[PDB]
Structures are given as C-alpha cells and as structure tokens.
C-alpha cells in the first residue's frame, strides 16, 4: 500500500531500538545512499524520532 508521491504517509517511530543490520547486511538491493551518517556507526549514534 505504498501511497503515490502526490500524497504519502508519515511514519513516526516511538520509543524503541534502531537496528540497521537488516538494511545493510541483509538484502542489499541497491546503493546505501547515506546523506550524512556513518554506515558502520549508524546505531552507535542515535536521534529522537
């Protein structure tokens, strides 16, 4: 149910743990395309939402 680009849905992440191993090491479809973040240290540094 991926909405169209004219109107999408916002996904707000509550209090939980961010694990990005399933994104990088598991199913590496295409480029990581990190904007400003350490791909090895994605989880070692964390944000609010």
């Amino acid at each position: 149910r991926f909405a169209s680009v004219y109107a999408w849905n916002r996904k707000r992440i509550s209090n939980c743990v961010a694990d990005y191993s399933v994104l990088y090491n598991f199913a590496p479809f295409f480029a990581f395309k990190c904007y400003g973040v350490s791909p090895t240290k994605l989880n070692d540094l964390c944000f609010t939402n």
């Epitope: 149910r1 996904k11 509550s14 939980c16």
Partner: antibody, heavy 123, light 108 residues
C-alpha cells in the same frame, strides 16, 4: 532459536469458554504481531485471530466478528484465548503464529507469510 | 473476499518428475500477492515461499515460482520421494484466503 510452546490437550463442553495459551520466545517480542489460525482434517486453515504486541488493534475475520476475544502479554510474551460460544464438534486444532503480513505497529500490508508456527493444542 | 480457483485435485505422479501447481486468481491480483506453504501428514504446515520466487525455508532445488501479472504457477523438479507435501497458495490483495489442497499418493 525461536521457541513456541503450548499447553496440552483439553476437552470443553458446549456453552463454556476454552482457554488456550501459546508462549513465545527466542525472537524480539516487539517487531511482530501474534496471529491465530484454526485447522481441521480435510480442509485448510482460516483467518480467525490477530492481535499486535505494541498496541491492541483488532483485525479479526468478519465471519466470526465479535466472536473471538483474546489477549497478548509481554510479561511472558504469551497469547491467551477465552474462546466463547463453544460447540461440541469444534475439536479442531488452534495454532499460534508470527504475523509477517500485518504491521504490528501501524498495520501495513507486509509482503510475506506466517514463517513460524506453534506446537499446537487440542480443544 | 476473493477465493483462489484451484484444481490440483490429485498429483498422482512418480517422485522426481515435473510437478505443476495452479493458483489462478478470480479476476485480478497483484504480482507480489503470493505465498506458498507445505504440510505433511502428522506434521504442522511449514512456509515455502513468502513472495514471488524468493526462498523462505531452504528450498534446495525443488520449489520454484513462475507467472506474470495475474496468473502464477508453482513448479517442482526432482521431487524428494518422502515429502509428498500438500501445497497451499495464499494471496495478499483481498484479506487472506488459503488453497483447497493438493493430495499426492504413494505412486508405487
């Protein structure tokens, strides 16, 4: 690694409520909901139960809408049914499963299937 | 709801040969609305394919998927004699419906 354990066989008279439990372990009990299916010999399965873990969103089947009520507990990560409106010839097996089709937080249309099943109980 | 038109009534063929499982939809389903499962006598169902053709539980050389658009098909090559598993196919667009069931006998 994942362990789904369940109680033994039970027989419940008609008109009562059968309590069925399934303890889940071995997987993080926050990223997946708890689904519940029924099976009888000579036929496939159904879509009778689903309750999430983060929230209590209800997505039961319309065929038995308002007939199934159940709880999920994070203390032991156990699913409990207090199934009512019991019938004599509903001695069909009930299976707990990990929902990888319904979103456990928002309710997305997750591509995939119920990759895991419990050991089963007899009612 | 939308049910899947299934007619693998009885795949009474010798193990190790080509096996075809039909899961034609009713009118129209998305290509990524598929799920194939196996069940054995005296054994709980196990998942086989969670998507179009990706492997979910092992699948060394037997289970494969083909099709395009709406129609899709399951293919088995070099079937292991012991399994004789009853196959189920489930969609994703309209709620969740299972297959009727495919019975396979000994074929001595």
């Amino acid at each position: 690694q994942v362990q789904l354990v369940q109680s033994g066989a039970e027989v419940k008279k008609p008109g009562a409520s059968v309590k069925v439990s399934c303890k889940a372990s071995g997987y993080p009990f926050t990223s997946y909901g708890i689904s519940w299916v029924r099976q009888a010999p000579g036929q496939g399965l159904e879509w009778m139960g689903w309750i999430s873990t983060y929230n209590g969103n209800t997505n039961y089947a319309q065929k038995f809408q308002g007939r199934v009520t159940m709880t999920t507990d994070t203390s032991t990560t156990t699913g409990y049914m207090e199934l009512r409106r019991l019938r004599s010839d509903d001695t069909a097996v009930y299976y707990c499963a990990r929902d990888y089709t319904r979103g456990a937080w928002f309710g997305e249309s997750l591509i995939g299937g119920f990759d895991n099943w419990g050991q089963g109980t007899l009612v | 709801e939308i049910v899947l038109t299934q007619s693998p009534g009885t795949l009474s063929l010798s193990p190790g040969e080509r096996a075809t499982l039909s899961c034609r939809a009713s009118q129209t389903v998305s290509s990524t609305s598929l799920a194939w499962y196996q069940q054995k006598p005296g054994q709980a169902p196990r998942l086989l394919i969670y998507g179009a053709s990706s492997r979910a539980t092992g699948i060394p050389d037997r289970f494969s998927g083909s099709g395009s658009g709406t129609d899709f098909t399951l293919t088995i090559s070099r079937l292991e004699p012991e399994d004789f598993a009853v196959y189920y196919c489930q969609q994703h667009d309209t709620s969740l419906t299972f297959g009727g069931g495919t019975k396979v006998e000994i074929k001595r």
